[PDB]
Structure formats: C-alpha cells, structure tokens
Amino acid sequence: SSVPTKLEVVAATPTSLLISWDAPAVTVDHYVITYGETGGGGGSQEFEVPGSKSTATISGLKPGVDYTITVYAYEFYSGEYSHFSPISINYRT
C-alpha cells in the first residue's frame, strides 16, 4: 500500500548506486531520497528529486557496505505537505 510501488537498484558502481522506481498513478510534488548505513552507524543523508522524475543516482558511498535506501513521495494538497507510505530496500554496495 506504498508509494512508489517498487524501488530497485539498476546500476551499481564501487562508490555509487543508480535507483529507479515506479511512477505512482497519482499526483506527487517531489520525492526525498534517504540513504544511510543499515545499522544506524553514520547518520542518514538525503536529497530531493522533482515529482516528475522516477530516477536518482546516489553518490559518495563506501564500497562493500550495507546501505538502506528509503524514498518518500510527498504531496502538496490543500495547503499541506504529507508523504505517502514510504518504501525501503537494502543493497550491499
């Protein structure tokens, strides 16, 4: 019951990940892409992607680390920012 519906890593590189997802069938202002070492270690970092795009590329990662990417789809409906149920994946760089 999530938005985006599917989140995958398409391209990988020793220091970077390329991620694609599925255009929700409903209106979306922007996405926030969130990524950090799975296991709390080293604070999470994030960056923002226009609602029209369904592709991002994550940079400056450490090789051979378990990262946990999470994507929030924000709306801006009658006056308010609110995100749908987010989606996460784990990926070993």
Author numbering: 6 to 98
The publication says:
We determined the crystal structures of the l-DAM21-d-Abl SH2 and l-DAM27-d-Abl SH2 complexes at 2.7 Å and 2.9 Å resolution, respectively. Of note, to satisfy the large amounts of protein complex needed for crystallization, this batch of the d-Abl SH2 domain was not desulfurized to alanine after NCL and therefore contained a cysteine residue at position 198. In both structures, we found the d-SH2 domain to be dimerized via a disulfide bridge of Cys198. The monobody FG loop, which represents the most extensively diversified region in the library, forms a large part of both interfaces, which have similar buried surface areas (431 Å2 and 440 Å2 in DAM21, 452 Å2 and 427 Å2 in DAM27, for interface 1 and 2, respectively). Interface 2 of both structures largely contains the pY peptide-binding interface (346 Å2 for the pYEEI peptide), whereas interface 1 comprises a region of the SH2 domain surface of unknown functional significance. Unlike those, DAM21/27 form a heterochiral anti-parallel β-sheet between strand Gly84 to Trp88/His88 in DAM21/27 of their FG loop with the βD-strand (Val190 to Arg194) of the d-Abl SH2 domain. The rippled β-sheet position Glu85 in the FG loop is inserted into the SH2 pY pocket, where it forms an ionic interaction with SH2 residue Arg171, which is part of the conserved FLVRES motif and makes the most critical interaction with the phosphate group in pY peptide ligands. An additional ionic interaction was observed in the DAM21/27-SH2 interface: SH2 residue Arg189 interacts with Glu51 in the ßD strand of the monobody and is located at the other end of the heterochiral SH2-monobody interface. Structural superposition of the FG loop conformations of DAM27 and DAM21 revealed a strikingly similar conformation despite their sequence differences in seven out of eleven amino acid positions. In DAM27, Tyr79 packs towards the β-hairpin and His88 is solvent exposed, whereas in DAM21, Trp88 is rotated inwards and would clash with large hydrophobic or aromatic residues at this position.
Among the most commonly used non-immunoglobulin binders are monobodies (Mb), which are generated from large combinatorial libraries using a fibronectin III domain (FN3; ~10 kDa) of human fibronectin as molecular scaffold. Here, we develop monobodies with nanomolar binding affinities against the d-SH2 domain of the leukemic tyrosine kinase BCR::ABL1. Two crystal structures of heterochiral monobody-SH2 complexes reveal targeting of the pY binding pocket by an unconventional binding mode. In summary, monobody recognition is dominated by the FG loop of both monobodies that form a rippled β-sheet with the βD-strand of the SH2 domain, as well as ionic interactions between glutamate residues of the monobody and arginine residues of the SH2 domain.
